[PDB]
Design a protein around this nucleic acid. Structure first.
Lengths: 217, 314, 385, 275, 76
DNA sequence: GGCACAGGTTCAGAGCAGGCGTTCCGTTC
DNA sequence: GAACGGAACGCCTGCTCTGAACCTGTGCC
C-alpha cells in the first residue's frame, strides 16, 4: 500500500502504471478495508480517459462495501473522502460514472454504492445536476430504484450523507413537484428516513423545507 | 361624487366587505387609482393594501397597470428633473413590500402580474417595464415558487433588448423609423444605482440575477455575432451588476465573494474568465473584505495544484 | 342503480364514499351485487324476451346494470394480484349462474363459462347503449386470456339490426371495436363502400342499416382513421427479406390504396362541410404513412419488382389528383373550416413527388423523372378556368 | 461617421468601381460587393441596388422560357458568365435575408403596440421593391447547385414575411375596417408577377435532371427534398391567411390571384437501357 | 424625539421616542396609545420589515420620518 | 506529375419554437 | 337554446445553428 502512495505521487509512464493498476484490480476483493482509500485514490489517478467506463464497471461490480461492515464506518468515510477529492475536477471519471450506472439501469440488482454516488455527485457538481436529475426520473420509472435500497442506504451509509442533508432535501423538493406518484412516494420516503437517522439541525431543516412546500406549491 | 382627499382610504375600505361584480370593483378601482395623482405621497401604501385585498375578488390587472403607469411616469418625471427622492423611493419600497406580502396569500395575483410583464412579443418589453417594475420583480423573486419564472423573464427580456439594439445599430433604415426607447440593461443599472435607498430584499434577487447571467450566457461556445455578441453584453451586464452592487452594500460583499470563489474553484473544467476579471475588479475596489473570506482563500490553496495555471496566476 | 353507477364512476375513472378505499367498496360490492342482481338481470332478460313507460324504465335498468358490471370488472386493482382471489370467487359465481360441480376450476375455463352466459342476452336488448356496454364488458373479461371472432360476430349483428334516437359517439366506439377485431380491415371497407352507394340508390336506411344520410359521416370517419392506423403498423424490412414477403406487402399496399381511392371517390355524391373535413384531415395522414413506410421498401425492391410499383404509383395519382381538386374546391367556396388543413396536405403531396425523384436517384434512373403541370378541375370533372 | 462627406465620396467612388470594371476574378468582386453593402446599409436601404443587380444577372445568364431577348449589363459592371452565377446570386440573396429579418422584426414590434401609418408604408415600399427583385431572379436559368437551394429558402422567407404582415392586418381591420390601398396593390403584385413564376421555376428545377456512398447519398437526396415543399407550405399559408382577411374585410383578395397550379409526375422509357 | 406612523385606516399617529430606544418599545407605545398588541403589529420603514432587537439608530430613522404598520392577523 | 490550402460537406450535439392535446366559449341555425 | 367550431397553456419532435475535421479538387512548382 505505501508503494501505491509513492507510485501515485510520482511521474511514471501510463503503461507500467496500467500494469500495476491491473496488479491492484485483480487483488480488490482479497483485501481488508484499512488499505482501500489510499489504493482507490491511486486507482482514481491511474485511469486513462478510455479505460474509464470499463474500470468503473469492473470496480463497481467487483466490490463488497458490506463484508467490511468502529474502524469500518471510519475508513469507509475516508474511502468516500478519497472519492470526493477525485470526483471534484476529473469529469472524465464523474460523467463516466453517471453513464456507467445509467447503462446498468436494465438490471434492478444495482446496489447501495450506485445511489450513494448519485447523492455525493449531485451534491458535488453544480453543473452535472440535471443529467443526474433526468437519469433518476427515468430510473425510478422502470420499477428500479425502490425503497429497500434507500432503507439500508440510510441504515448504514448515513454518516457520509449526514453532511449531505440539503443535497438530499433539494432532490426530494425537485421530486415532489412533478407527477407520477412513484416520484412523489420516493421523495417522501427520502424525507422520512433522512429526518429519521440525522441530527436535530437536519430535522429542523426538514420541517422548514416541508412547511415551505406546503405554503408554496 | 368628489372625495375628501384625507378620508378616501376609509371610503375605499368600505367597498372591501360588500360583495360586488367585476364592473363595480372596476369603477371604484379606476376612479380611486385616478385619485393617486392629486395627493400627498405617504398615505398611498395602506390605500394600496385595501385596494389589493379588494382586488383579490375582482379586476387586479387594472390595478397593477395603473400602479406601474403611475410609478414609471413619476420615475421619468424624477429622471428629467435630475437631468424629492429620499421619501419617494422609500414609499416605493414600502409599496413593493405590501404587494409582495399580499401575493404571499394569493398566487393568482402573481400569475396575472407576470402575464402583464410577460415580454411575449418583444415590443411589449418596450412598453411593459420600468426600473420600478423591475425592482418589484426582483423583490418578488424571494418566493421559492417564483424564483424560476421571474428570472427567466428578466434574463430573456435582457437578451432580447440586446438583440434589438445590435440589429438597430447595423441598420440606418430602422434608425430613420424608430426613436430609441429605454433598453433593459440601463433600466437595471438605474435600479441598482437607486438601491442605495437601502431596501435590501432586492439585493439578494439582484445578486441572484447577476450570477444567473454569468452562469448561462458566458463563453462556453467560446473556450459569430448572433450567439456571440448579444450573449456577451449579457455576461458583462452580470458582472457589471455585481461589481456595482458590491460598491454600495457592505452587508453583502462577503456572500458574493464566497459564491464567486466556489464558482472559480470547483469548475476550471469550464472557462471562467469573466469571473476572474470580476474578482480582480472587486479586490481593486476594496481588498479588505478578502480578510473575511480568509477561510475559502486558504481552502483554495489546498486545491491550487488540481487547479490549472491561469486560474492561479490571476 | 343510477346511484350506484354514479358512485363507481366517481370512485375509479361524494365524501362518505371517498373516506373509504376503492378495494373496500368493490370487496363489499361482490356480496352487494353479484348473486342478487344476476337474478334481476335474468328477470330483465325474461321481460325483454317479450306499459311503455315500464319498458323505458326496464331498458334504463338493464344498461345501468351492465354499466355497473363494466365499472366493476375494469378496476385496475385486478391487475395487481391481491384483489384476484375476489375475482376468482366472482367468476365462480358467474359460472355457477348456470352449472355447479366444476369447483376450483382453471381460470380461463371459468372466463369461457362467464362470457358464454353473457352471450345469451344478445337478442333481448332493446337499445344501442346496452349492446355497447355488453360488448365492452365482454372484451375486458376476455383480455384475461381467436376470441375476436365472437366479438366481431356480435358487433356485426348489432351494427346490422334495425334499432327502433341514436347518438353518433356510441356508434363511433362500436365500429372502432368492430374493425380492430375483424380479420381483414381492407375487404371490410370494400364491402361497406360497395354499400355506401345503396344509401343513394334506394332510400331517400340500407342493407347495412344504422346508415342514414346522417350517419355516413361516422362510418367514413372511422373507416379513414382505422385504415390509416392499420397501414402505419407495417415495417419495411430489406432486400435480405424475400421477394415473397415484399410481394404480399405490395398486394397489401395495393388493396389499401384502391380502398382509399374508393373512399375518396364518395365525396362527389356526399358533398358537405364535415365529410370533406374528414378526407382533408385524414388524407395527409395516409400519405405520410405511405411516405414513411412504403418508399424505403420500393428503394429496396425496385429493379426486380418494378412494374407493380409503377401500377401502384400511377393508381395513386388518380386520387392524389382528386385531393388537389379538393383543396381548390375548398379555397373557392371560401370555407375557413376546411382550408385550415390544406397546406399540410399540399406540402405532403409535393414531398411525395420529390421522394419518388430521390427513389429513382438511388436506383440510377434520375433523368427519366419527368413532370407535367395539372389541369384544374372541380370534384365532378371539368377544366375549371 | 455615416453622414460625413468622406463616407459619402467613399461609397460613391466604390459604386463607380462597381459600375466600371469587369475584372474576371471572383473573390475580388465578392470583396468589393461585401464592402459596398457594409457601407451602403449605414447610409440607406439596399433594394434598388438589389433590383439593378438581379436585372443584370437575368441579362447575363438566360431565362427559363429560352426565348426572351434581354441585356442590362450597363447597371453594374462586375459580372461575367464566370462571375455572377455561383457567387453574386448567393451574396445578394444573403443581403435580402438581412432585409427580411429587419422587416419581420418591425412587424413583431407592431403587434407589440396592441407610429403605425409611416411604418406600414415604408415596410410595403421595401417589400414591393424586392418582390420585383425576386421576379427578375425567378425568371432566370440559374445552375442546379447551391444558389438555387438558397433562392428557395429566401422565397420561403419572403412568403412567410407576407403572411406575418397579413396576420398583423387581421388584428387591425376587424377593429376599424381597413386594408389601405397600398397593401391591396402589393397583393395584386404578389399574385401577378411572383407566384405563378414560382411554380414555373419549380418545373424548371425538377425537369432539369442530368460514384457516391449510399448512406451519404440518402443524406444528400433527403436534404434535396425539403425546400420545395417548405415553399409550398409557405405559399399556401399566405393564401389561407388571405382567405381569412377576405372573410373579415368584405373584399375578394383572391379575385387578384389565381387557381394554385399543381404538379403531377410521370416516368418514361429510359429505365430499359440502365438494366 | 418625534416620528410618524400610518396604518391601514390612515390614522396618522405621532410617536415621541429617543433614537437609541428599541422597536418593541414602540410596540409597547402602540399597545398604549392605540390599544394594538405587539404580536399582531408589522412595522415597516421604506420597504424594510423592522425587527424587535434593533433601534432607530440601526435603520438611520430620523425626526418626522414616517413608518407604516399592518395588522398581521395570524388567523384573521 | 505531386502537395497544400480551400471549400464543401457531414455529423454530433444542443437548444428552442411551434403545433397538437385538453378544455371552454362564441356563432349560426 | 344547443352544438360544433374557434381558442389558450404545456410538452415533445424535429429542425436548425454552429463548430470541427476529413477529405478531395485545383493550381502552381
Amino acid at each position: 500500500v505505501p508503494i501505491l502512495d509513492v507510485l501515485s505521487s510520482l511521474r511514471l509512464d501510463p503503461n507500467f502504471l496500467l500494469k500495476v493498476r491491473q496488479l491492484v484490480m485483480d487483488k480488490l476483493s482479497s483485501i481488508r478495508l484499512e488499505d482501500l482509500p489510499v489504493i482507490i485514490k491511486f486507482i482514481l489517478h491511474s485511469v486513462t480517459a478510455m479505460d474509464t467506463l470499463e474500470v468503473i464497471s469492473e470496480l463497481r461490480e467487483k466490490l463488497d462495501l458490506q463484508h467490511c461492515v468502529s474502524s469500518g464506518q471510519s475508513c469507509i468515510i475516508l474511502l468516500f473522502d478519497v472519492i470526493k477529492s477525485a470526483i471534484r475536477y476529473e469529469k472524465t471519471i464523474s460523467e463516466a460514472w453517471i453513464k456507467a450506472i445509467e447503462n446498468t439501469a436494465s438490471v434492478s440488482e444495482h446496489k447501495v454504492f450506485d445511489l450513494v454516488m448519485l447523492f455525493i455527485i449531485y451534491s458535488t457538481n453544480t453543473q452535472t445536476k440535471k443529467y443526474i436529475d433526468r437519469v433518476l426520473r427515468n430510473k425510478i420509472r422502470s420499477g428500479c430504484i425502490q425503497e429497500q435500497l434507500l432503507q439500508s442506504t440510510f441504515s448504514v451509509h448515513y454518516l457520509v450523507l449526514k453532511d449531505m442533508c440539503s443535497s438530499i432535501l433539494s432532490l426530494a423538493q425537485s421530486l415532489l413537484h412533478s407527477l407520477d406518484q412513484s416520484i412523489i412516494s420516493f421523495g417522501s420516503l427520502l424525507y422520512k428516513y433522512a429526518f429519521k437517522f440525522f441530527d436535530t439541525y437536519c430535522q429542523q431543516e426538514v420541517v422548514g423545507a416541508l412547511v415551505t412546500h406546503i405554503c408554496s406549491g | 361624487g368628489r372625495w375628501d382627499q384625507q378620508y378616501v382610504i376609509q371610503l375605499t375600505s368600505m367597498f372591501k366587505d360588500v360583495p360586488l361584480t367585476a364592473e363595480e370593483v372596476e369603477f371604484v378601482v379606476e376612479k380611486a387609482l385616478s385619485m393617486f395623482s392629486k395627493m400627498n405621497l405617504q398615505e398611498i401604501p395602506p390605500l394600496v393594501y385595501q385596494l389589493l385585498v379588494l382586488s383579490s375578488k375582482g379586476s387586479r390587472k387594472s390595478v397593477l397597470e395603473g400602479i406601474i403607469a403611475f410609478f414609471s411616469a413619476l420615475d421619468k418625471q424624477h429622471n428629467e428633473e435630475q437631468s424629492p427622492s429620499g421619501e419617494l423611493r422609500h414609499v416605493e419600497g414600502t409599496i413593493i413590500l405590501h404587494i409582495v406580502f399580499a401575493i404571499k396569500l394569493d398566487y393568482e395575483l402573481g400569475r396575472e402580474l407576470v402575464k402583464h410583464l410577460k415580454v411575449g412579443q418583444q415590443g411589449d418589453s418596450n412598453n411593459n417595464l420600468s426600473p420600478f417594475s423591475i425592482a418589484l420583480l426582483l423583490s418578488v423573486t424571494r418566493i421559492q415558487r417564483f424564483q424560476d419564472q421571474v428570472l427567466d423573464l428578466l434574463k430573456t427580456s435582457v437578451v432580447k433588448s440586446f438583440k434589438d439594439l445590435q440589429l438597430l445599430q447595423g441598420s440606418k433604415f430602422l434608425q430613420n423609423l424608430v426613436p430609441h426607447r429605454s433598453y433593459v440593461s440601463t433600466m437595471i443599472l438605474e435600479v441598482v444605482k437607486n438601491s442605495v435607498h437601502s431596501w435590501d430584499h432586492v439585493t439578494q434577487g439582484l445578486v441572484e440575477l447577476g450570477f444567473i447571467l454569468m452562469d448561462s450566457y458566458g463563453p462556453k461556445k467560446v473556450l459569430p455575432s448572433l450567439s456571440r455578441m448579444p450573449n456577451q453584453h449579457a455576461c458583462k451586464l452580470g458582472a457589471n451588476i455585481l461589481l456595482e452592487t458590491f460598491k454600495i452594500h457592505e452587508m453583502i460583499r462577503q456572500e458574493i465573494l464566497e459564491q464567486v470563489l466556489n464558482r472559480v474553484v470547483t469548475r476550471a473544467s469550464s472557462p471562467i474568465s469573466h469571473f476572474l476579471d470580476l474578482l480582480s475588479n472587486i479586490v481593486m475596489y476594496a481588498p479588505l473584505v478578502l480578510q473575511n473570506c480568509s477561510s475559502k482563500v486558504t481552502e483554495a490553496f489546498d486545491y491550487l495544484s488540481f487547479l490549472p495555471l491561469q486560474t492561479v496566476q490571476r | 342503480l343510477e346511484d350506484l353507477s354514479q358512485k363507481l364512476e366517481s370512485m375509479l375513472t361524494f365524501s362518505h364514499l371517498q373516506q373509504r378505499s376503492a378495494q373496500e367498496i368493490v370487496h363489499c360490492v361482490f356480496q352487494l351485487l353479484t348473486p342478487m342482481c344476476n337474478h334481476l338481470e335474468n328477470i330483465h332478460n325474461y321481460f325483454q324476451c317479450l306499459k311503455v313507460q315500464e319498458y323505458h324504465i326496464m331498458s334504463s335498468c338493464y344498461q345501468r346494470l351492465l354499466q355497473i358490471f363494466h365499472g366493476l370488472f375494469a378496476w385496475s386493482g385486478f391487475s395487481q394480484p391481491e384483489n384476484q382471489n375476489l375475482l376468482y370467487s366472482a367468476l365462480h359465481v358467474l359460472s355457477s349462474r348456470l352449472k355447479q360441480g366444476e369447483h376450483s376450476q382453471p381460470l380461463e375455463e371459468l372466463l369461457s363459462q362467464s362470457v358464454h352466459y353473457l352471450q345469451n342476452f344478445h337478442q333481448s336488448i332493446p337499445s344501442f347503449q346496452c349492446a355497447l356496454y355488453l360488448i365492452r364488458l365482454l372484451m375486458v373479461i376476455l383480455e384475461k386470456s381467436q376470441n375476436k371472432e365472437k366479438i366481431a360476430s356480435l358487433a356485426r349483428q348489432f351494427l346490422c339490426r334495425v334499432w327502433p334516437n341514436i347518438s353518433n359517439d356510441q356508434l363511433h366506439a362500436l365500429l372502432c371495436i368492430y374493425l380492430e377485431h375483424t380479420e381483414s380491415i381492407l375487404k371490410a371497407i370494400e364491402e361497406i363502400a360497395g354499400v355506401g352507394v345503396p344509401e343513394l340508390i334506394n332510400s331517400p336506411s340500407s342493407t347495412f342499416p344504422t346508415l342514414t344520410r346522417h350517419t355516413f359521416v361516422v362510418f367514413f370517419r372511422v373507416m379513414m382513421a382505422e385504415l390509416e392506423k392499420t397501414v402505419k403498423k407495417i415495417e419495411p424490412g430489406t432486400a435480405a427479406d424475400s421477394q415473397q414477403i415484399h410481394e404480399e406487402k405490395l398486394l397489401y399496399w395495393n388493396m389499401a390504396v384502391r380502398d382509399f381511392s374508393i373512399l375518396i371517390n364518395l365525396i362527389k355524391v356526399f358533398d358537405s362541410h364535415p365529410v370533406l373535413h374528414v378526407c382533408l384531415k385524414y388524407g395527409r395522414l395516409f400519405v405520410e404513412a405511405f411516405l414513411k413506410q412504403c418508399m424505403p421498401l420500393l428503394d429496396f425492391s425496385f429493379r426486380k419488382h418494378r412494374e407493380d410499383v409503377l401500377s401502384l404509383l400511377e393508381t395513386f395519382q388518380l386520387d392524389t389528383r382528386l385531393l388537389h381538386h379538393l383543396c381548390g374546391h375548398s379555397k373557392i367556396h371560401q370555407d375557413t373550416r376546411l382550408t385550415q388543413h390544406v397546406p399540410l396536405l399540399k406540402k405532403t403531396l409535393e414531398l411525395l413527388v420529390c421522394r419518388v425523384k430521390a427513389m429513382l436517384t438511388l436506383n440510377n434512373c434520375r433523368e427519366a423523372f419527368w413532370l407535367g403541370n395539372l389541369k384544374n378541375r372541380d370534384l365532378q370533372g371539368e377544366e375549371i378556368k | 461617421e455615416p453622414s460625413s462627406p468622406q463616407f459619402v465620396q467613399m461609397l460613391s467612388w466604390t459604386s463607380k468601381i462597381c459600375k466600371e470594371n469587369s475584372r474576371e476574378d471572383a473573390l475580388f468582386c465578392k470583396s468589393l460587393m461585401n464592402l459596398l453593402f457594409s457601407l451602403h446599409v449605414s447610409y440607406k436601404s439596399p433594394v434598388i441596388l438589389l433590383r439593378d443587380l438581379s436585372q443584370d444577372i437575368h441579362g447575363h445568364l438566360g431565362d427559363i422560357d429560352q426565348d426572351v431577348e434581354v441585356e442590362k449589363t450597363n447597371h453594374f459592371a462586375i459580372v461575367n458568365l464566370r462571375t455572377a452565377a455561383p457567387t453574386v446570386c448567393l451574396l445578394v440573396l444573403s443581403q435580402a435575408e438581412k432585409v427580411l429579418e429587419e422587416v419581420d422584426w418591425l412587424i413583431t414590434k407592431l403587434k407589440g403596440q396592441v407610429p403605425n401609418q409611416p411604418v406600414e408604408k415604408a415596410i410595403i415600399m421595401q417589400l414591393g421593391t424586392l418582390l420585383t427583385f425576386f421576379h427578375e431572379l425567378v425568371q432566370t436559368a440559374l445552375p442546379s447547385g447551391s444558389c438555387v437551394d438558397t433562392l428557395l429558402k429566401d422565397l420561403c422567407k419572403m412568403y412567410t414575411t407576407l403572411t406575418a404582415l397579413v396576420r398583423y392586418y387581421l388584428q387591425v381591420c376587424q377593429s376599424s375596417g381597413g386594408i389601405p390601398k397600398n397593401m391591396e396593390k402589393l397583393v395584386k403584385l404578389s399574385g401577378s408577377h411572383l407566384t405563378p413564376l414560382c411554380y414555373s421555376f419549380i418545373s424548371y428545377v425538377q425537369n432539369k435532371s442530368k460514384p457516391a456512398v449510399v448512406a451519404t447519398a440518402m443524406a444528400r437526396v433527403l436534404r434535396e427534398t425539403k425546400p420545395i415543399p417548405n415553399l409550398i407550405f409557405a405559399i399556401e399559408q399566405y393564401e389561407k391567411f388571405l382567405i381569412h382577411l377576405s372573410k373579415k374585410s368584405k373584399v375578394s383578395l383572391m379575385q387578384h390571384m389565381k387557381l394554385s397550379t399543381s404538379r403531377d409526375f410521370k416516368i418514361k422509357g429510359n429505365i430499359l437501357d440502365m438494366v | 424625539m418625534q416620528i410618524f406612523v400610518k396604518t391601514l385606516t390612515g390614522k396618522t399617529i405621532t410617536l415621541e421616542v429617543e433614537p437609541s430606544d428599541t422597536i418593541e418599545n414602540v410596540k409597547a407605545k402602540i399597545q398604549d396609545k392605540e390599544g394594538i398588541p405587539p404580536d399582531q403589529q408589522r412595522l415597516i420603514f421604506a420597504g424594510k420589515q423592522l425587527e424587535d432587537g434593533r433601534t432607530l439608530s440601526d435603520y438611520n430613522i430620523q425626526k418626522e420620518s414616517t413608518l407604516h404598520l399592518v395588522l398581521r392577523l395570524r388567523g384573521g
